[PDB]
Every structure is written in C-alpha cells, then in structure tokens.
Design a protein around this ligand. Sequence first.
Ligand SMILES: [Mg+2]
Lengths: 272, 49, 49, 107, 49, 49, 50, 40, 198
Amino acid sequence: EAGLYATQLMTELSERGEKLPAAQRRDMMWICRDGDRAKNHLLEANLRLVVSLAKRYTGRGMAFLDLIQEGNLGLIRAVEKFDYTKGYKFSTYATWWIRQAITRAMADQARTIRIPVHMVEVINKLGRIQRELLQDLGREPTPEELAKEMDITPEKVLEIQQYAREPISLDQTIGDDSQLGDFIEDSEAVVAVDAVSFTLLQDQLQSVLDTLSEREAGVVRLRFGLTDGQPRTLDEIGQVYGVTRERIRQIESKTMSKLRHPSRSQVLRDYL
Amino acid sequence: KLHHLVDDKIHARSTGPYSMITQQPLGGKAQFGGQRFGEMECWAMQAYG
Amino acid sequence: QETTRVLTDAAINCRSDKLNGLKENVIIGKLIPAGTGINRYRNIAVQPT
Amino acid sequence: VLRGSRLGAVSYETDRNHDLAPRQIARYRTDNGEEFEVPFADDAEIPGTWLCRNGMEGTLIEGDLPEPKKVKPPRTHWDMLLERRSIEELEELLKERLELIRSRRRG
Amino acid sequence: RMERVVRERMTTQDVEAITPQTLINIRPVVAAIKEFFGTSQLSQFMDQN
Amino acid sequence: FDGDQMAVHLPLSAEAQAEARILMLSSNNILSPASGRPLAMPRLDMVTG
Amino acid sequence: RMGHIELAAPVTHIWYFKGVPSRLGYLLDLAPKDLEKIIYFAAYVITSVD
Amino acid sequence: LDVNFFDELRIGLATAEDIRQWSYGEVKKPETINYRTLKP
Amino acid sequence: NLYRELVDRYGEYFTGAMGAESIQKLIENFDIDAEAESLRDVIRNGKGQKKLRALKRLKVVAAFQQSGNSPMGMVLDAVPVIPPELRPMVQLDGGRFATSDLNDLYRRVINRNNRLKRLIDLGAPEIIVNNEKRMLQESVDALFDNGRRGRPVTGPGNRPLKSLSDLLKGKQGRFRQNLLGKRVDYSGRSVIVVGPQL
DNA sequence: CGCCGTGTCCCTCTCGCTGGCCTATAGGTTAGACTTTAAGTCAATAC
RNA sequence: AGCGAG
DNA sequence: GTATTGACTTAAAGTCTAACCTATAGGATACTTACCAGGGACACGGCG
Ligand SMILES: [Mg+2]
C-alpha cells in the first residue's frame, strides 16, 4: 500500500507539481520499488497455495499447467484486493479468488465450442443434479426429475444438455487404419450431375423463352432476374420501358398462361 | 457355401460422395466408393509409358 | 522417406525443384516426362495427307 | 455415410466479370506506418477505423479524424485499494514507513 | 478410482455427518465396466455365421 | 480363382483410350519384361492337355 | 486463405532445434543440452559482453 | 493456375514478415463457432 | 542464484537472457561471414575430431551463407494459421460436431499467448511469466510436432493429438496416401471367374 | 587424438470387407406487435 | 477389432 | 388484343418496447511442491 500510494502521489505531482528534494525523492522511490518487491515476494510465497488448490481440478477439461497459471492470475487478483485490517489469514481470502479464477477459466478455455459462463454453470448444475438423482434413484433420472430439481421447463433440460455435447475428432482411428475424417461425405460439393442438369435446364429454358414473343421474354426475364440475377417487381419494369405498372403485370400473366401450355411444358418438366 | 458371396463383393462407381478435407472420393462399397489407385499401380502405369 | 529431415534441410538450403522426375510430375498432377509424355511424342502434329 | 456438412452452402450463379457493382478503394493507416487498401462499396459510409490485415486497428488516412474516447484503464490496484481504504490512514502508513527508512539510514 | 475419490472427499467430509451411501460414488466403477464391455478389444462382436 | 477380387478402371479421354488400346492391350503383352519368357503361354490344365 | 497468431514472445521452430543434428546448435555452436536449457528456461545465457 | 507455368517449386524458411504477409488477418480469440447459432 | 548475484553486482559488462528470445538475440549478434571464414580456416589447418565437428557445422553455416537466407527464420514471431477448411468443423449426422484435431492445438497456442499478454500487461513476478513463456514454447512445439519432446499432448481417450507434422510423415501421411496414390472415379471391383471362351 | 558404450531416431507390402457452488449489475440481443410503404390485384373502359 | 487374396 | 385509372387488399419492412442472454465482478476459519520386436545409422560422453 505504501508503494502504491507513493507511485500515485508522484504521478499527481508529475503534472504541475513540485521539484521534490533529492534525498526525499530517492527514499520514496525506494519505497515504491519495495512495494513491488513485496508484491512479488507474496505471489512467490503463495504459488504453492495456488498449485495445491489447482491440484483438485486436474484430469477434466484442460491441462494442469494452464490451471496453475489461471490460479496464479486469480492469486494476483486476490493480492490486489486483500485487506489485513479485517484481520484474517491471507490463505482464507485468496482461496476463493483462486477457485473463482480456475472455475472461470474452465468455463471459458475448456471446450472447443465456447459455451458462455452462465450456460456453463447451468449445465454443470444439471450434471451434478442428475449425478445425485443417480445416487438416489439409481437409474439415470429421466428429464422430468431434472426439470423439477432445476426449476426450468423440461424442454430447457433438453436444450441445456444439447448445448453441452462435446465435439469429436475426425482424426480418430475408427478401428480401435481409417480415421473418421475419410468416412464423412462433403455434402456441399458440386455433385457433377445436378451441375450438368442445371446447365441443360438453363439452355432449354433459354430456348423455350426465345420461342415466345420478344417482349414476353423480356418481361419474364427481368421479373425473375434471369438475365443478370437481380429480380424486380412490376414498377421497375414499367419504369424502364416507360409504361405503367399494369401493362407489365398483364403481359406477365399472358406469358405464364402461354408457357404453361402442354406444348412448352414437356420440354421443361423433369427439371423440377 | 462360404460367406463370401459375390452379391456383397460386386461394386461400381462413376461419381458420388467426395471426402471432406480432400477430394479423391470416399472409399468403400458401403459408401459409393472409388477404387484405390495406389503407388504400385501408378508405377506400373509409368513403366507402360 | 524421412520427410521431416528432408524438408528441414531443403528449407535451410533454399532448394528449388525443377520438376523433372516422374514422382514430382505425378505429385503436381502433370504429364510425366516418360513414354508418351516426352516432348517429341506429345506435340506430334497430325493432319490429313 | 455419416454425411457431414461445413454449414454454409454452395451457390451456382453464373460468374460475371462484366457488370459489377461500383467500388471505392479506401486507404487506412495502422500505427506502424502500414497502409492498407479496403474495397468498400460506394453506397455506404467509409468507417473511420478498420482492423487491418496487420492485426491492429488503423484509422482512415483522409481528413475527418473523429478521434473518439473510451473508458480509462479498466481498473487498477490503486483504485481497488481506494474502495477499502481512505487517504488519512494511507498517509499515516507512509509516514511510518518514511520514518522507518530514515532511522535505517541515519537513525 | 472410487477409492481415490473417497479418500479425496474424506478430508472435506463433516465428521458424524457421513454414511457409506453418501461416501461412495459408484460412477467410476460402472463407467469402467461399460467402457470395457464396449470398445475394449477383448470384448469382441460375437461372430455368428 | 479362389476369391481373387480385382478392380476395373475406365479410361476416358482420347489419349487414355489410345494408350489402353495400344500400350496396355492384353494381347500386346505376352513376354515378361523381366526376362522375355512368354507369360501368356498355356499352363496347368492346358499343358496337361 | 491463411491467418497468423502474433506471439507475445518469440519461440523457436522445433524442426531446427530437436531434429538431430540440431541445426540451431550447429549454427550457434551450442550443445543440444545447452540449447534445450536456454530455450525451455532452465539456464541463462550471455548474449553480449563489453 | 496451369501445370505448364509450374517450372519450379522453391522451399525456404518463412520469416515472420512472410508469415504476416500471407495472413489475411490475425486470429486473436481462441473461439470456433457459437454454441447455439452454430456460426463462425 | 549465481546469475542473480552477478546481475545485481556486475550487472553491466554483460547482458544475459533466457528462452527463445535469447537465441533470437544471439542470431542477431552473429555475423555469418566471419564465422564461416573461421570455420573454413579451422577445417583447412586443423585436423582430427575437432575438424570433423567443424566440417559438420559448415554444412549448416554454409547453407545460410550461399543463399541469401537469414538464420533468423528459426525463431518465430508469428505462427501461420492454416485455412479453416483444411481443419474442418463438420456437423455430422445427429448434430454431433467433429473437430479437426488441429483446432485444439491452435486453441492451446492462442490461450497461452493471450495469457502471456495479460500476464505481461498486469506485471507479474519473473517465475510466473517465465513459466508462461515456457508453456507457450511447448504449445508451439506440440502444434508443429507432437511427442518429439516430452510426452505427446494427449486428447480425449488418452491418445496423442494429431499435430501439424503428422499429416506429412508416414505411409498414412499426405505425401504417400493422398498424392502419389488416390481413389478414382469410374472404377469398380468384383470377384474374378475364369472364362475360357473369351 | 582412436576405440567403446550408451542414447536417440527412422523403418518395417498392396488391395478389400464388416460394424461400435451462489449472488448482484450492466449491457446486448431478439421476438413481437404497430405503423408505414412498396407491392400485388380486380373491376370497368376505350380504342 | 475379427476377416479375405497374394 | 392492347392501351389505362381507380380503388382494394397484402407482405415487407422500419421501428419501439420488453425479456432473455452475455461479459463481468465477487465471495474473508483455514487450507502452501502432481502424477516385452529388431535392425540399422548417427551423435554424444568416457576412457586410454
Ligand atoms: Mg488366391
């Protein structure tokens, strides 16, 4: 505290302050450096506490050294917010801060798909409650029991356990020579048959459109945006051709009626 | 009559699923699998010129 | 063989591959320089007599 | 087959290079004197700060320069101390420490 | 594993407030048995041709 | 023929078809490339006959 | 398209350290044990001397 | 592009400048997708 | 202990460092031309096992001279990140997502790098920050090659994590399982039966 | 400066099939309805 | 993991 | 059949308000160091 106060006071006097005397300033810088020295000494002292605490969170979720470093951050925070005037042992206070830091790190940096904290806590709760109802009922508690013990709708139990489905690895040898990766079909690849089907569909659609009168072709084209991929309504086509909206609507109706005729439908079926 | 019946052994492919990270379609009759053309076969083709 | 050693040394040496053998051409998916792929047979000019 | 997906999708739409929306390349400058072009569309205000390829934010290089402000340093050990201690006791402790060091040096 | 969890919790167990039912966790044992009878290599899929 | 499966590949392009028909045709490959002794000569039942 | 992580502190490529012969060691004439000590914060090393 | 304009294939060390010249950005957060909306 | 006593006493007159950045400084203060010339003189004039070690070192000290390659590429300041679809995250049937086994190593690297940034920002004793730096070095090592140093980084099921170099080495690696040999379309398989009428 | 022992690294065929804790604050997000507007529609009409 | 051909 | 106007209803916004996620902080008895191969080649430390 003395070092921190010295640092703050000198920061205040760094602007529109006073030229402090050499001896007093030197002594005060010794105090500030001693404050940081004391902070480092305390942290180094309780690193053992951090390790002993993080021992109990090992084997699940993440590695051991990551837990130690998160606990070290928590202990730094505790030392920042530690009061002795309340007259209590340092370990008692720092234990809760280290526990909180480790638990938060587990919540965040443990799952490949990050579930935010509040969700993480509710799922961990669900797991514990089903574990205890497993200790009591023996058979895994059915969604009803959890929903009752958790004061949420049972569908909420469903979604809380759906969000918490850990991913798998596509590099698992499924045997016990083949990784799961090369057994999974890319379902978004050009299938090479629908591609040619679409090409021929566009070709035949263009031909059958060329059959009907030119204005008719133009109206249907610019209605569905076939020409350049931009579809518009009646008003736009009316504007571009300098005709009221209604004429375009009417010719569009006539076009649909014509193209629906069995003559120009058997050349376009088997594509839908 | 051994359980190696030809009905379970026949397989053919012209096009079908393709693997995820790479193309080179999935292998296996269970999928629509292409027949592996390994390095020995490729050496045989190189020898043929 | 020994892919890691080979690549470490090649990276250290700044080795440029001229893509002249059969394995390199196979890897990069271009015609091998053997048999029908050599420069004298590949670019035969064909026209009616 | 397990039949997975990368999410997203495909869209066969005949690629066009002829009739394309107009663009206005906007230059940004990071802290480490690195310019970065960004092809924004004309029909949208050019933002004043872009997270460039460098990985650090860069302001626009034209005029403008809105220069906003943000929260001061999220917190600080001194600030946390002032939420549990006051100035008079801290000053008293500073005096005790100062007298202790003075006694150490000269008695 | 159950023994280890029992010992670990025993430190944080309030004396005279504990009974074996609330001191024993069967989950590791059932988990080990289930992971053996499935995915253990000596627990093989019955071969009934 | 005691279960010896084999694979069938289909050349597509004009060059592939020409190579399969000329270079690889089974009736063009009688002698072994190793020693030159015929490899398609009769054996087993036919030699006995 | 690739990205890149900006390391807060430098690291050494493992291929040029552990792959026997240690190319970093041969370049710097540091024994593999010494290089492993320095790189993994087990022993200090002097980089300049006036 | 084309296997005819593939005359050489050089390999060498990639300096930090090359690494950050390839990059189109910087991955700064250790996240993959949203748990609920399943989007990047 | 000896180092600290030195630094507090004869702190000037010598600069000491620790870790990859120390190797960075060493390579920075390293003229390749003079070292190569001295090595060439030693191999030419000297003899014996000393000359043998000198000669092997000239197969790596010459390489960084003949080419205009810096010896600095060994030490990394930025780690490239492979495009996402080469390490896909796919929603398999049943919703069960499947990671790529490389997002885990990248996640570890990024977590440790961000934690190092925060530890340096806050101001931490050299013990914790040096431990964090060692962890970051180990994470990058595991990313580039698992199990080369120390026990391999293991995932669920107590199996090693498929690193970024395991994709290239071996009969199941990329160079040999997906480049020289591929699965092809327009292909079938079947049991063969003799036809003597053909 | 040789000879020896010990530690470490890389290699070990092709193809194919089947199936197995708790609380408190502050802030951002979305869903849901209201109001407006571009949009789709019908009826009568004149040339 | 069991299994087929060489 | 092709040129219009005047209503007449409708989906898509565009927006304001409310709840339900989200990033974040905190918690004071005391607890202080975790957990079966070979076969060849090359390189490093000891000893003579
Ligand atoms: Mg046979």
